[PDB]
Write a protein that binds this ligand. Structure first.
Ligand code: 53W
Length: 127
C-alpha cells in the first residue's frame, strides 16, 4: 500500500532547449492551472497512504501531477511540447479512472481540464 518514488524531474542524459511552445506551457498553461482554487490536490503526487487509498497504485501505473510537470518545465526535462501535454492528459485521466462521476475531485479535475483546453487552444506554433 506504500507510495512509489515520485516521477523523475531532472534528466542528466538529455539535451535542453527553450522553445516558444515550452515557454507558453510554463508561463500560461501551468501557471494558470497552478493558481486555480482547485489546484492543491494536483500540486504533488497522490499520497495514497495519507489519503487512505491502498489500491491507488494497483490501479494507476502512470501517476502524474502538476508539481512534477512544473519541475519538469523549470528543469527543461521536456524537449517536445507534446511530452508536457501528454503529462497533463495523464494526470486528468488517472483521476477519472480512480474516482467516480459525481465525486468532488472529478468535478474539480473536469474544471481544470476545461481551463487547460482553453489555454492549449492558443499554444504557439512549432519552430
Ligand atoms: C491526509 O492526507 C492528505 C494528503 C494530501 C492532501 C493534499 C490535498 C488533497 N490531495 C488530494 C488528492 C485527491 C485525489 C486525486 C488527485 N486523485 O484521486 C484522489 C482521491 C483527492 C483529494 C485530495 N486532497 C484533499 C483531501 N481532503 C482535504 C484535505 O484533507 C484530506 C481530505 C491533504 C491531506
Amino acid at each position: 500500500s506504500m507510495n512509489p518514488p515520485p516521477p523523475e524531474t531532472s534528466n542528466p542524459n538529455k539535451p535542453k532547449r527553450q522553445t516558444n511552445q515550452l515557454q507558453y506551457l510554463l508561463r500560461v498553461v501551468l501557471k494558470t492551472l497552478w493558481k486555480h482554487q482547485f489546484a492543491w490536490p494536483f500540486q504533488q503526487p497522490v499520497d495514497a497512504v495519507k489519503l487512505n487509498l491502498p489500491d491507488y497504485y494497483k490501479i494507476i501505473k502512470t501517476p502524474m501531477d502538476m508539481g512534477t510537470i512544473k519541475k519538469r518545465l523549470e528543469n527543461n526535462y521536456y524537449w517536445n511540447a507534446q511530452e508536457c501535454i501528454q503529462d497533463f492528459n495523464t494526470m486528468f485521466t488517472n483521476c477519472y479512472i480512480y474516482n467516480k462521476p459525481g465525486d468532488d475531485i472529478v468535478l474539480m479535475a473536469e474544471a481544470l481540464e476545461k481551463l487547460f483546453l482553453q489555454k492549449i487552444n492558443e499554444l504557439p506554433t512549432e519552430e
